[PDB]
Subunit: 170 residues, 12 copies
């Protein structure tokens, strides 16, 4: 069994090595893709020290979404941004990660990771309900609060859960 | 009378020269524009051996969508990707092609071309329904299953129809 | 009290300096961000002659939307393209401007600027309704008609109102 | 009946839109050239939304000064920098705008635009009188003092007059 | 049994995919290489959707002509330009495609494709005669007259024949 | 009538403006193309001060040889290098200049310009003879001796004759 | 008080750290700017080991001449080239250095540094004479002879005086 | 004896080979420099085929004006643009050609080449008069009228005279 | 006496340091040129540790073929490719190596180096006889069959002879 | 109380955020530098989400080692490579990181992190002892064996310890 | 059994092909890595004609030293620079080559190649002694005098022995 | 007709090198210059060529030969000499042209140390200076001084390169 991790434009993408690692215990291949806006949060060579394949549509523009989707029994968005959730809910797919996801709702799990204002946005909530309606699994993200070093303020968030929790959810 | 062909990111865009040839039998100008993602499937210099105008937003970023729309009696999306359909259904126009289409629903004909999984995605079907409600012509593309050389598998697709059927539909 | 001006890809963005000047009569900081397609319409150094901060994610990709959002009491979109309205109505936030506006519906005022046909597009009109229902404040622009030098034709538009009208509305 | 606007390196170049629009009510073509130093204050693609030709030395280095001069009945420098005035007074033509003007004193109208200390420089003052002695019309611009937002101080300048005053003068 | 398609700098190169698909019904591998000049008429990633190997001298300058020749039972030049026909006749092999052909005359078939004036150049005639004498098989290309969209004129040509005839000739 | 000047890689290419001026006395249009090696000897913008059209394959790789040949009543090579002469005689056409010349022997004049050693090379003479047989007109160039500044030696050459002799030859 | 050192295109610019050091004994800030030509004679990160601000027009093209000028009690040109002296005498300000100086004659001291032939050029002497009449302070430069390594010859110059003479003169 | 030819931004600069050859009959070294704006009119490598040294300030920025002037018994400006005439007369030297000329009035011969309007400009005439006063020789340029291919209009010019005429003047 | 070694695109070019060392015992200068295609097989700086001049067309595109030919008493092509032998045989000189050889058949010695299939091409065999008829000496190279490491198979070639045999033949 | 974390060319440099976070509890500023070879393992914008300052010699080559050392009460190397350990011990300091540590032995702690063959290289052990004798504090890292995804093999290492252990040791 | 050859910055590196070929008589794979300064002495694609893998840090920065070391039974440095020897003795490993050797002293054999003066340097001799005590095998090279063409002088060196000698020693 | 080569390292005192060149020209026929890799950013090679005879630039000519350069010079000096360069030399590390030149020519080599006192007093640096002396390299008995540093606005202690006349007397 193979899993594809879809990484979005969040700081929490920098922890993905710890999820590659736990997932390699129970899946044969753990592969990773990033959104265009996600590529700047990550180091492609570093992911390749853990995951089996890094799809990079900038290096290989002609990678096929159907073939990638078919190779995987599970596809997760972790961390999932508001933008990616709301694109997927409306069938928007102007990059490879979004297109893969659009081909495979039945294999798809989303791990919401965002600021509370974005999570509680009416459009986001409705779109999360469309997706649940359409067969996509959404992790029941807890609302946490925490000191953010970059701003020197407390921020309220829903965040990607711990790795072992991902393994149970999928 | 003038027609505009809008090419999306699909391998079926490399057959566009055949449709241009046949549309020149009915139309004064056959002009062409590609989506950003569709640019990599085609060769704009080859396109200009057959079309009258190739609109290229990268070469000329101040191209005007209203002026382009107004100059055409018919605008077609061939091949029409899932992405482009779902974007057009939601009013998203973040490239020139999409902006042109937004301006001219009453002139707009779409030829879906995509994997069956994407065609059957509930969101895409919802969006197809909406486009029809807003008066966009949608070609009744047939579902075919052929052997794909690129993956060495059989795939099920809705596909752009032969050129003479495009002529009859618009 | 601080105000953020979000400009979209419209020729009316070249008049933003007058809006900045007039807005500085009433707010401490007048700041500015452009859409990605917006950038080509404005001159960033010229904007910095009048505004206090010009937020540029191509220059600084890790600018944080929530910190910029919280910094401001009012966020206006002017001129507001159909694209940006339709993305925001759908929760789509794939550049920084969009991500800011997504986080702050309750502070948002939109000044539509687009051709009649885009304005009358039923999706645009549905989404404008939707935004108002979710607490976004939308200027009641009227269709005007003027001679457009670029096309040597009369064009019908909704346009950004004069600065005094902006001050009044927000 | 043709007019050329020559723009120099002043922030008042950003309002050339309004002058072009006004001049278009009285002249067949309204064309534009910028000095090398003025290019950075404007956006050529925006300029071309309003003027008939934007002459760009860097795009087309072999543009001819006599042919361009001959094409126009009236050539104006608005806003005219102290540099460009003093170069023209001394016959210095190391760019296309200055070379055009050197060829066309009989057709030339100058609208000074500068800080008062530059306007009051005896060298500038001497060059103005020379330019008048040799048949160049210099707008009798008056000193004005306003708050400059960029420096947060009041500044005295002589400024280009509003559009209608330009039509009245030339 | 493997075949190598050598494509030259002709617009008829854009139809190469139909010949590839046809040749895949008989041959195990169908591989492709283009002349230096032919590269601009084609898209290598699109070719790789249908062919097994696309040999690219620019990307892999050390590709070995002898190993490539030896891997293939048949080598065809389609479309064959006058230039390539004439360089092969004369032992000129200054690119990878021509070098390969030079090492494998006994495996070589040529499908002339060129304006009649070039086909009836006496030098080209003489060189077709000399290539047959060396046991290179030259398709007996028929002359045809057609309307050419790119010139808005009728051109006389010898043309690559339909794919089924290609299969039948080799 | 129109004439095309093909310039090859020789320092006599720097005098071509005197040929254009003389040819303009007798030809509606005098156009110019250079060999790839000939480009480094000339200045394109300087040529376009004198000639009507300068065809530049690097700027426009899809210039059509047929369409260019057909526009011209007489095509000349002046100065014609040994390399170009020998290539035309063998039907090699790996640039645009040789391709055009390959399609119009009927209309082709050649003005040898080269050192004596190259002129008296037997392969050149054989090729000169073959071109004469197949309809091309070779100017009976004569052998001169001249002090050459670049080497500080007397060299023996065959050269392009004076401009008026070019007019009387064609 | 603040002083601004303006350096021109001269090898004596390499000694400016010693003048900066000297001036820091009297002035609060010693800031530095180079002419465009001057820039190749110096190293701006090395200048910044000594001065407070290094104004760099190529890095920050919108630096304001009036605000820089106003910040400084004294502005000195050291070493002042014949070019800069003559441009200043004529009101030519085509770079930031010359513009600043143009706005601040009353604050300006010049330290002529140049070959004797350039000093005794009558135009330079005329311009020195006019600069004095306009109230610009000119160091009474003395004429030294010395062996110059670069040419291996004896050269006569007027040169910048020692640091202590500079402090004393301003 | 050694002579330096200074070329300016004029199309007449493309015959300088003819002047170089002539001047070699009576001068041991014939060297050449272009103004920055004259570089686009000439080919430096073609120049080095005839001249002894081509002084290229872009490739060697530290070429020394005093040393270059000292090497030459005569410096000639041919063709001399109005800009370069007017800059010499005002002691401006922001390129190497201007600087070398500022250092050696007593060795300087100027051959004016320009449109009549520039020649009859009162500022240009002032400056010609001043240079004669200061010992520069100015060739008695005649006014000629001729048809200019580039514009397709008769132009009035003062022009650099025949080569032998230059030799008897310097 | 001086000797020039012309290197072509063969892996045996890597051995040329041995040949230069050998030849330096008999000839004053031993100089080297590469074919355009051969440059990728060699290291110009390494060549320069051994040969006196390395002629590089790309670094020095105006290197003169006559001057270089004349400097040398013997010119050899080692290793000589089928391409270069066939071009020279037909007077084709589209690079500097081939142009030098074209000038000096009477000085020229060729050491073939190519796969047997190429050597046994009737075209090559023909061109070899022609070259001998024109007085070019062709080493009587033996056919040899070696294990080739790069392909893991045995190959039949004709091969450049050992250095000492090159001294004996030349 | 500031602490500087120095980062070396190790895969454990990807866990550094976790150390930054823990250290910001006990220290006011936690700052970061990487070795030249550490840079490719790290994301400098991501680091700036957690650290106060990131010293980047490539962006700011003139950062002063003495000033950076003086600013910090503790400097730690973590992860510390063999290379960096062995350079520091011999006083080699050809990057900013090593020069900072060369200036500050009395503040320096080292957390070695490398394969066991490197740790047990006798030169590394000797160097570790010298550093101990020179006041540097070496974390007594334990040997651990573990499965490395990157190789698919078990590896023995000394590794950087958990963040809390780092706090306890410095 | 596999062997790794580590090439350093020496002109004797251009003979490494003979070493690889002879080593392929006894080892399954013969692989190769160059030092950073050695890269400029060799031609990578040429090396891949003979070796099985050429390890290139610049093309693949994440290549792993432990994995490469473990793969090989013998690692040889040849030619071995003074620098590399002295770096290895000290534990310095700031490129991939050095890092490999650092990890595998027990498999390492060094073939010194340097000037007498570097070889006789006391540090170099202490370092050779140190490496022997640490298990490294050092070829007991002899000083030989050779005439060096590069300098036209006789030089004294220790050099890499012939391939058969390498086979014997390792 | 002796020749001296000045080796410049990565320190702000390299900015003064035209003065030393001017003065060495009274004692030496050619005065030539090379910089370390990091040293290059402190200087302006074309400015150096106004004063020196040859500026050896490894970036512009990567095949310059350290043996031929060393043999052309009677005296080789490192001025200013960084701690890194001294410690690389002590250990035979020659990863650039300057360092390779010094490795080949210890018997000709004089070092004028220039660095913060902390680096001078680092025992590693002190051990290497002693070894360099053991192997016959001349080390200028550098002056320890405390001066106000504009760049940091603080007082720093340094060993510093000496005035040009002291260089002339030491070599
Ligand atoms: Cl101003
Ligand atoms: Cl054709
Ligand atoms: Cl001077
Ligand atoms: Cl071969
Ligand atoms: Cl050596
Ligand atoms: Cl220091």
């Amino acid at each position: 069994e193979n899993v594809l991790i879809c990484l979005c434009g969040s700081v929490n993408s920098i922890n993905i090595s710890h999820y590659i690692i736990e997932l390699k215990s129970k899946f044969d291949e753990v592969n990773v893709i990033a959104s265009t806006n996600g590529r700047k949060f990550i180091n492609g060579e570093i992911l390749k020290q853990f995951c089996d394949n890094y799809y990079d549509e900038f290096e290989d523009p002609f990678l096929n979404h159907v073939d990638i989707a078919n190779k995987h029994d599970k596809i997760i968005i972790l961390p999932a941004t508001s933008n990616t959730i709301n694109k997927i809910a409306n069938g928007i797919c102007d990059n490879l990660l979004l297109t893969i996801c659009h081909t495979a709702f039945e294999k798809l799990s989303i791990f919401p990771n965002m600021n509370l204002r974005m999570w509680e946005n009416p459009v986001t909530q409705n779109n999360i309900r469309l997706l649940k309606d359409y067969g996509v699994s959404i992790y029941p993200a807890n609302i946490s609060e925490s000191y953010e070093l970059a701003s020197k303020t407390f921020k309220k968030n829903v965040v990607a859960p711990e790795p072992y929790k991902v393994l149970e959810f999928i």
